[PDB]
Symmetry: C2
Subunit: 169 residues, 2 copies
């Protein structure tokens, strides 16, 4: 399936490369930010560029120092991550590296382009299969050593509360 | 198929975003470099990080000024491209933005991991289907306006000569 290929490329072309170096980048920034990469997986494939627009209680703090690596003819290809503070009744309840799983934008876009041959009704099913495949990959991956957490959800809602339930172990 | 999803995500998550801004970045660097993004598509899915290791006549010149954009919770996500000089009998015969199509690394890796459920024999077929799907996408895409060229090839070989045949219109 397309969700199967998306989960494998997201692991091979991104997670496999940043998850080994992540704790070192977090330690560097901490000179406190939590140790895992928190990945938001909205099953509706709704991926806004601004997290604060999804929930005002999710607030951008700072960028994590960039990771660079020569890859496939690209000198110093850059991998960037953002740090967010999570508010709960006016209080900073958590601080973590947080982002949406970008392949869900591909599912959203493919469901909209007629040439992609993917119906708008198939988004939910493909997102669920992307989630399951990625969980199966990370469960058995050596690069994932208590440093990655997938947060999958369907709105019937507090996004910051869903993140916080995961942050609080 | 997985090649279908890879071609659509490579377009949606990368090409769709950089191809509109590419001529402006090339004009900026030129204050001469050719106007198209040249994408190497080895059908054997062999993707080395160093182009000069694939052919000594392909020589790294400089980085093209980075492109940044806020995306899916990432503040200032970076898109980087490299400029190469192409030598032919000691002479600089061309200068272009050149890189390998990264999803071919996913096909290579999936053919090696038992959990991916993709045989090592299926690489060639999947790379060909990735190529055809991407050509079909770019043929009809509004972002592609004489600014992208796919260079697909099978070794029986000069890589620099294959690039140069495309560079010379
Ligand atoms: O990297 C993958 O293995 C991969 C596999 C499938 C689909 C996609 C979509 C992307 C996004 N690309 C970038 O962010 C990017 C930034 N500089 N840059 C230079 C060359 C190529 N890509 C990029 O990567 C993919
Ligand atoms: O971007 C896509 O739409 C896409 C779709 C499918 C597979 C892949 C693999 C990649 C490579 N990722 C990066 O280069 C990258 C760099 N910073 N960063 C921050 C968050 C996420 N990804 C990245 O992007 C994909």
């Amino acid at each position: 399936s397309v969700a199967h290929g998306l989960a494998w490329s997201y692991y091979i072309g991104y997670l496999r490369l940043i998850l080994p170096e992540l704790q070192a980048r977090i330690r560097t920034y901490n000179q406190a930010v939590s140790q895992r990469l928190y990945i938001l997986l909205p099953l509706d494939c709704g991926v806004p560029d601004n997290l604060s627009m999804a929930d005002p209680n999710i607030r951008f703090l700072d960028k994590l120092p960039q990771q660079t690596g020569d890859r496939a003819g690209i000198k110093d290809r850059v991998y960037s991550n953002s740090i967010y503070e999570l508010l709960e009744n006016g209080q900073r309840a958590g601080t973590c590296v947080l982002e949406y799983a970008t392949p869900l934008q591909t599912l959203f876009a493919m469901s909209q382009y007629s040439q992609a041959g993917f119906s708008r009704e198939d988004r939910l099913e493909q997102a669920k299969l992307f989630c399951r495949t990625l969980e199966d990959i990370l469960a058995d991956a050596p690069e994932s050593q208590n440093n990655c957490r997938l947060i999958a959800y369907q709105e019937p809602f507090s996004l910051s509360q869903e993140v916080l339930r995961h942050l609080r172990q």
